From a paper:
Vaccines and therapeutics targeting the critical viral spike glycoprotein (S) must accommodate the mutations in S. Even the highly conserved region that plays a critical role in membrane fusion exhibits up to three mutations in the HR1 region of Omicron variants. To reduce the public health threat of Omicron and future emerging variants, we and others have proposed development of antivirals targeting the relatively conserved heptad repeat 1 and 2 (HR1 and HR2) regions of the spike glycoprotein (S) that drive membrane fusion by the formation of the HR1HR2 postfusion bundle. Although the ~130 residues of the HR1 and HR2 regions are conserved in all prior SARS-CoV-2 variants, a few mutations have reached fixation with Omicron in the HR1 region (Q954H and N969K for all Omicron subvariants, and, additionally, L981F for BA.1).
Starting with the previously reported longHR2_42 peptide we chose to insert an additional residue between HR2 residues G1167 and D1168 which are proximal to the Omicron HR1 K969 sidechain, anticipating that this insertion would restore inhibition activity. We selected glycine due to its flexibility, hydrophilicity, and proximity to the naturally occurring glycine in HR2 (G1167) (peptide referred to as 42G). To confirm our prediction that 42G better accommodates the Omicron N969K mutation, we determined the cryo-EM structure of the complex of the Omicron HR1 and a slightly longer version of 42G, termed 42Gv2, to an overall resolution of 2.8 Å. The structure of the 42Gv2—Omicron HR1 complex maintains the overall six-helix-bundle architecture of the SARS-CoV-2 postfusion bundle and the packing between K969 and F970. In addition, the structure features a bulge of the 42Gv2 backbone at the inserted glycine residue. This bulge results from the deviation of the 42Gv2 backbone around the long sidechain of the lysine residue of the mutated HR1 N969K, promoting closer overall packing with HR1; additionally, the terminal nitrogen of this lysine and the carbonyl oxygen of the inserted G form a hydrogen bond, presumably contributing additional binding energy to the interface. Additionally, the insertion reduces the overall displacement of HR2 in this region, partially restoring the HR2 backbone to the original position in the Wuhan strain structure. The average Cα atom rmsd for HR2 residues 1,162 to 1,170 is reduced from 2.4 Å (between the Wuhan strain HR1HR2 structure and the Omicron HR1HR2 structure) to 1.5 Å (between the Wuhan strain HR1HR2 structure and the Omicron HR1—42Gv2 structure). Our structure of the Omicron HR1—42Gv2 complex shows that the glycine insertion restores the backbone interactions on both sides of the inserted glycine and Omicron HR1.
Author numbering:
A (entry chain B), C (entry chain A), F (entry chain C): 918 to 988
B (entry chain D), D (entry chain F), E (entry chain E): 1159 to 1201
């Protein structure tokens, strides 16, 4: 009878730990997807910012060139 | 002719950052950490 | 006696796994708070960058307009 | 009159990114993964 | 003399964001959640 | 004999849960390293962006000053 109690409560504990491991797996999966998304987004921001700032550089350069042409 | 509008470059509005919602899983972990006391053996 | 050993060590194991699940819960909670903070921050950066760059666009436009007025 | 100072827009200094410190919890998980060997049954 | 090239400032290309790959650990967790059924006691 | 079964399967379960806790520890460690890297990167981006935009501000200011000098 005590063996039946140990077996039943061990089966219950293993079921609950299975649920906990499935929950931890799902949570780490969502965290992975989100952190990777944000990383790709920050990398895209870095690259396209580099592009836009280079464009701004060229624009200001032509600005200063026109100014020198005037003066 | 006058100068055209300056196209400063890429449209940075396309960038966006998701938001993770794992409160279900965290709450489940705490619920299990509390329910494992219903599985302790007491002979 | 062996049943008492099994019961005691199973109770110890379940206590340690309770501590581990509480630690995993706290860790995932902190990771969630931090990743969400960083996501909101990156989104704020994206929006306010869009604003500042639009402003720069208007400014350079007026610049070029004044230049054309001169030349 | 001369032109005023250009206000390029928002003050991006307000933006900031936190830093997660879960080394306590990771160390606790490894400590438990090592201490569960003190709970293996040996009849 | 004409004006030099404008150095707009820092070289933002040095910035970069890593990418986490914990698919091994997530797959191991699911494999263990499936293999714990081989450890249920059936007297 | 049933006690030997309970003991063997409990040892197997504790071994598998040890593997799962080690995997969760490694996963949270990698997630911590990556989220902290991305946070430092976003902070660097914020600071150096502030610098570059201040520079752009000064440049446009001198631009407008030269313009006023012309006109």
């Amino acid at each position: 009878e005590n063996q039946k109690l140990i077996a039943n409560q061990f089966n219950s504990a293993i079921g609950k730990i299975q649920d906990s491991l499935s929950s931890t797996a799902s949570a780490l999966g969502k965290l992975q997807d989100v952190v990777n998304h944000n990383a790709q987004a920050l990398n895209t921001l870095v690259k396209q910012l580099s592009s836009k700032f280079g464009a701004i550089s060229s624009v200001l350069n032509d600005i200063f060139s026109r100014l020198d042409k005037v003066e | 002719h006058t100068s055209p509008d300056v196209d400063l470059g890429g449209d940075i509005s396309g960038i966006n950052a998701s938001v993770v919602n794992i409160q279900k899983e965290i709450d489940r972990l705490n619920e299990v950490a509390k329910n494992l006391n219903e599985s302790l053996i007491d002979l």
